[PDB]
Each structure stands twice: as structure tokens, then as C-alpha cells.
Amino acid sequence: MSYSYDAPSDFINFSSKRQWALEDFEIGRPLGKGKFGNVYLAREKQSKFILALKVLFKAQLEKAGVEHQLRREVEIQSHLRHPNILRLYGYFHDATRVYLILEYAPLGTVYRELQKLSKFDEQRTATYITELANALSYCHSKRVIHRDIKPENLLLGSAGELKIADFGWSVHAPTTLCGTLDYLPPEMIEGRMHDEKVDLWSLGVLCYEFLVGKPPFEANTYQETYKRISRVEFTFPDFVTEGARDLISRLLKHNPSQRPMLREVLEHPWITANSSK
Amino acid sequence: MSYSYDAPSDFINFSSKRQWALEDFEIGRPLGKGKFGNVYLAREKQSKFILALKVLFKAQLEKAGVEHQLRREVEIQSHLRHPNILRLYGYFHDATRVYLILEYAPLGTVYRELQKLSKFDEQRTATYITELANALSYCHSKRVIHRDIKPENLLLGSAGELKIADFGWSVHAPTTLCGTLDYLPPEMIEGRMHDEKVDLWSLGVLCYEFLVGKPPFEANTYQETYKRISRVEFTFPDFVTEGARDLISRLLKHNPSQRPMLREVLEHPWITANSSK
Numbered sequence A, B: 001m002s003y004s005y006d007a008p009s010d011f012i013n014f015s016s017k018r019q020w021a022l023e024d025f026e027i028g029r030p031l032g033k034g035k036f037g038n039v040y041l042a043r044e045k046q047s048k049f050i051l052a053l054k055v056l057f058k059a060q061l062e063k064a065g066v067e068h069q070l071r072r073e074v075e076i077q078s079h080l081r082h083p084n085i086l087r088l089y090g091y092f093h094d095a096t097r098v099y100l101i102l103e104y105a106p107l108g109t110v111y112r113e114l115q116k117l118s119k120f121d122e123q124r125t126a127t128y129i130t131e132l133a134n135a136l137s138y139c140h141s142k143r144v145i146h147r148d149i150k151p152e153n154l155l156l157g158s159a160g161e162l163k164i165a166d167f168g169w170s171v172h173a174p175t176t177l178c179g180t181l182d183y184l185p186p187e188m189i190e191g192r193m194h195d196e197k198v199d200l201w202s203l204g205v206l207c208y209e210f211l212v213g214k215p216p217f218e219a220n221t222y223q224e225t226y227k228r229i230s231r232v233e234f235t236f237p238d239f240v241t242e243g244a245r246d247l248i249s250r251l252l253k254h255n256p257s258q259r260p261m262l263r264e265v266l267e268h269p270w271i272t273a274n275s276s277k
């Protein structure tokens, strides 16, 4: 199995050829666990720069058949450079492990913040939505669709700003295929899971959860949650204001082509009235 | 870009580890011109084994941004071994070019055969559909979906056997993603572009085009073709027999889950009444 990715492996001087090596880092406390390894607080020794080192075990990746998914994740995320996207500085590997050198997000996940506060006020919510829409606008400039936006995948920077993480499901979506529609089924012509509008739906779900403290299609079985999503069946508690309802309802369209542009989110009158950014 | 693919580059003794080299091949006449380089008739020098060598220029692949598509195509196709799938024996590369070592299909494309004969009789049609269904059944057993089946991508071996070619749009489609449906849009839960049923629709279009000489949703604009596909709007000429109509109508279903399994195609009584296979 080849661990040669189109992603950087060069040593970086964080006080501003030689490839990364594990001995470049001091390791600190584990930050979390995954199915394939762990994430550690770490520090590059020459600069003393704090970062996160994600360690994945090759045997576990290859047994689960997810090694090409990791390769794509690293290749996509390492070429994104935006203040609301978690940086992937580079990667390296040894006989047993793959290492991802990540930006450290010191304030945790939005998931944990929702556990602590139950729900967010309108200003905190609208500020988060602006940051996310800015990040997703940049992603679309690079023809990247994230496709797995959810509170556990939103980390928090030193200023409390959002950091989109987990590009394990993302795709770069920029032809003889479409030159001829005659043999393509409707789902190949429409390409809905390859549509940037995928991420606009999750933006609506998140705006709802931030304000309400529960996601709009929540149900006690997966099948009922799918029915509610498929039928776009959701309602608002009384306290949700008219502007928030308008934004969320505009985002949660079954047909991806009916969802709004990111500019229309960034300029929505409820966003501009409550966002500090 | 990295040309280290998860695909074989080992020299093969064809008449029954050293890596391929350009000097292993006597390059004969061109077989065709592609977007990024030509395909040549060639023989491996030690064995005199006759094959096709596709030469692609790295500068052109990288300029066009299609090099990860080539990587995926090579990795997928080089691990498929079936008599009705065009073999990709291996690849190699030098400073300027990538080389694909391919099975030579001497008898051209089904697309050309259809141009020459205008339409096929029911025996040839059922035989071809049998071979395609066998090849696609094998693909799906490897969790590979082809997604670009059409007459131009069906080559003919020396006994007239179909060889499925062009895996440039295929996906290997075997999580935390589905662990939480609450944040996913309908199109991400359904995953229709990653459903093996994609290829069953194309098989129905092919069965119709083989018998009729034109595909069922043909229209002189792209928008009208899409509209007819979307509504599954098509008609049968009087000469298409009821048995063929039954099979084609079962395959051409908007809802992919309503399309039959490949075993049902192979076992359809019109197929077995007419196939020589």
C-alpha cells in the first residue's frame, strides 16, 4: 500500500529537502480517540510551536479498507488555507503509522459547547454561521465540498472562532461523461451528492441546532429521522424569531438546486443584524 | 504530482521484483489518439506478447487537473480480472509520461459495429447483455460501479467478446458519516451516485439501443434529453418484441431500488431464449 500522497511532507519553520520525522515533535496529552488511532497535543521542537498530531495505524486503515479515503482527506485538507478551516500542515509515515500534523484548536468542539450551554443566543449563532459560510465560500472557490458538517466537526480557535475539521468525506468537484447524456441514469446527470449545495443544507440544520439545542429532524429511530429529512418535516419552538425561521426554511430545501447561494446567507438580514463579523 | 499508485508495476512473464521499463516494449502502429496521448499496438520483447500501450504526458494531465482521476482509474481497473473486462496489466512512468499496459481488443468498438449494422438482432443483443451483466456482476462483487457504460466503451475481443473499458468514472463503493443522519441532506443519506443500480439503468439503455439503433431518450438538445430521462419518457418501435420490452422497461426505472438485480437480467426468459451464452 502506497503512502505517497499529493500533500506536503516537508519540515516547516513555524517561527515565521528536510522531511518531517517523529523526533521533530514533543508529544503531550491525548486529545481524543478514533477507530484508527489517537490525536495528541504536540510541539515542534525547534520552534516550540503547539499543534496536534493525529496518529493512525496502517494495519487498521488497510483492514477497514479506508486508506484511499485517508489519502483523499489529507490531499484535500492540506491545500486549504482559511482562518475558519483547521490547517493540515503536512503528513508523514513510518513502518506502522501515518501522522497528520494539524492546527491545534484550543477551545474544543461546538458539540461540547452545546452540551455545556444547551443552546446559543442569536448573536453567537449568527456569528458562527457567518464564519461557516465564509469557510464554505472559500471551499467552493477551490471546488471542494465538505459533506460532513456537524457540531462534532466544528472546532474552536483561540478567539472562539469556528474551525471546520474532518475532510474524510469531502470531494473535489470541478468531459466525455456529460458529452453524452443518453446512457446516464437520472442520478448521474443530477449528481446531487457532488453538488456544492450539499453543504448549504447542513448549514441550515446547524443554525437550527444552535438556536434550539436539538437538531430539527431528531427522532428515536434512524428510519423515522430519514422520513422526516426526506419529507422536510420540522417545526420551530415559539422563541425562534422570524428572521431565523426565514433563513433556516430557505436552507432546508429537499431539491439542492432550490437552496440559496452562500452570498445570500452572508447577506441575510437576520445574519447581518446579529453577527459580529 | 505523485505517480506512486496502488497498482502493479511488476514485470510480467506473459508466456506462463523487476519493474516495467519502456525498453520492455516494441512500439508498433498507433491504435488511436486520446486527449492526453496515444494508444499504440505493442509487444513485450521477451514474450512477444501483443498488447496495447497507452502513453500519457504528465505535463498535460497535471495542466488539466485530471491526474487523480487517472490514478483512480488505474488502481480500480488493474485489480479487475474478468474475460469481459479489458485487462489493465500494470502501469509505469518516467520523467515525462505515464504508461498503461492494456489488453489489446482487436475488433474495434460496439459503437462502430452499430454504425455498420444499424441495429443488432435479438440473438446478438441478448448475448451482449449476458456478457455485460456477467462483467458488471463481477465488478459489483468487488464493490466497483462503472458509471460510464455506453457503446464507445465496449471493445471487442478477437472472438467477438465484449470488453468493458474506460474506468475513468468508476468508484469503489463499499461509518461516522451515517452514524448521525441528523445533519445529512437527503442526497447524502441516499447516496444514489454510489449505488450499484447506476449500472443497471445503462444496461437497459444499451439493450434498447442494440435493438433499435438509437437510444431511447435521444433528442436534439441536451435539455430535452434530460427532460425525457427525468420523466422516463420513451416509446418502443413496433418491431421490438414484447419479451425485450419487458426487460428494458424493468431496467429503466427512475427509482434505482426498483431496478432489478443483475441475476434477474441473466435469468430473464427473453435473455435465455435468445443468448448464445
Ligand SMILES: Nc1ncnc2c1ncn2[C@@H]1O[C@H](COP(=O)(O)OP(=O)(O)NP(=O)(O)O)[C@@H](O)[C@H]1O
Pocket: A031, A032, A033, A034, A035, A036, A037, A038, A039, A052, A054, A086, A102, A103, A104, A105, A106, A108, A109, A155, A166, B176
Ligand atoms: N486539531 C485538533 N485540535 C484539537 N482537538 C482536536 C484536534 N483534532 C482532533 N481533536 C479532538 O480529538 C478527538 C479525536 O478526533 P478525531 O479522531 O480526528 O475525530 P474524527 O474526525 O472522527 N477522526 P477519525 O477517528 O479518523 O474518524 C476529537 O473528538 C476532537 O475533538
Ligand SMILES: Nc1ncnc2c1ncn2[C@@H]1O[C@H](COP(=O)(O)OP(=O)(O)NP(=O)(O)O)[C@@H](O)[C@H]1O
Pocket: B031, B032, B033, B034, B035, B036, B037, B039, B052, B054, B086, B102, B103, B104, B105, B106, B108, B109, B155, B168
Ligand atoms: N486496449 C485497447 N485495445 C484496442 N483499442 C484500444 C485500446 N485502448 C484504446 N483503444 C482505442 O484507441 C482509441 C483511443 O483510446 P482511449 O484511451 O479511449 O482515448 P481516450 O478515451 O481519449 N483516453 P483519455 O486520454 O483517458 O481520455 C479509442 O477510440 C479506443 O477505441
Ligand SMILES: *SC[C@H](NC(=O)[C@H](O)c1ccc(C(F)(F)F)cc1)C(=O)NCc1ccccn1
Pocket: A177, A178, A179, A188, A189, A190, A191, A192, A194, A195, B147, B169, B226
Ligand atoms: S453529466 C451532466 C452534468 N452533471 C454533472 O456534472 C454531475 O454533477 C456530475 C458530477 C460528477 C460526476 C462524476 F462524479 F464524475 F461521475 C457525475 C455527474 C450536468 O449538466 N449537470 C447540470 C444539470 C442541471 C440540471 C439537471 C441536470 N444536470
Ligand SMILES: *SC[C@H](NC(=O)[C@H](O)c1ccc(C(F)(F)F)cc1)C(=O)NCc1ccccn1
Pocket: A169, A193, A226, B177, B178, B179, B188, B189, B190, B191, B194
Ligand atoms: S449515510 C446513511 C446510509 N447511506 C449510505 O450508505 C449511502 O449508500 C451512501 C453511500 C456512500 C456515501 C458517501 F459516498 F460516503 F458519501 C454516502 C451515502 C444508509 O442509511 N443507507 C440505507 C438507507 C436508509 C434509508 C434510505 C436509503 N438508504
Ligand SMILES: [Mg+2]
Pocket: A001, A002, A003, A004, A067, A068, A071, B006
Ligand atoms: Mg495509498
Ligand SMILES: [Mg+2]
Pocket: A070, A073, A168
Ligand atoms: Mg481519518
Ligand SMILES: [Mg+2]
Pocket: A006, B001, B002, B003, B004, B067, B068, B071
Ligand atoms: Mg497523484
Ligand SMILES: [Mg+2]
Pocket: B070, B073, B168
Ligand atoms: Mg485515461
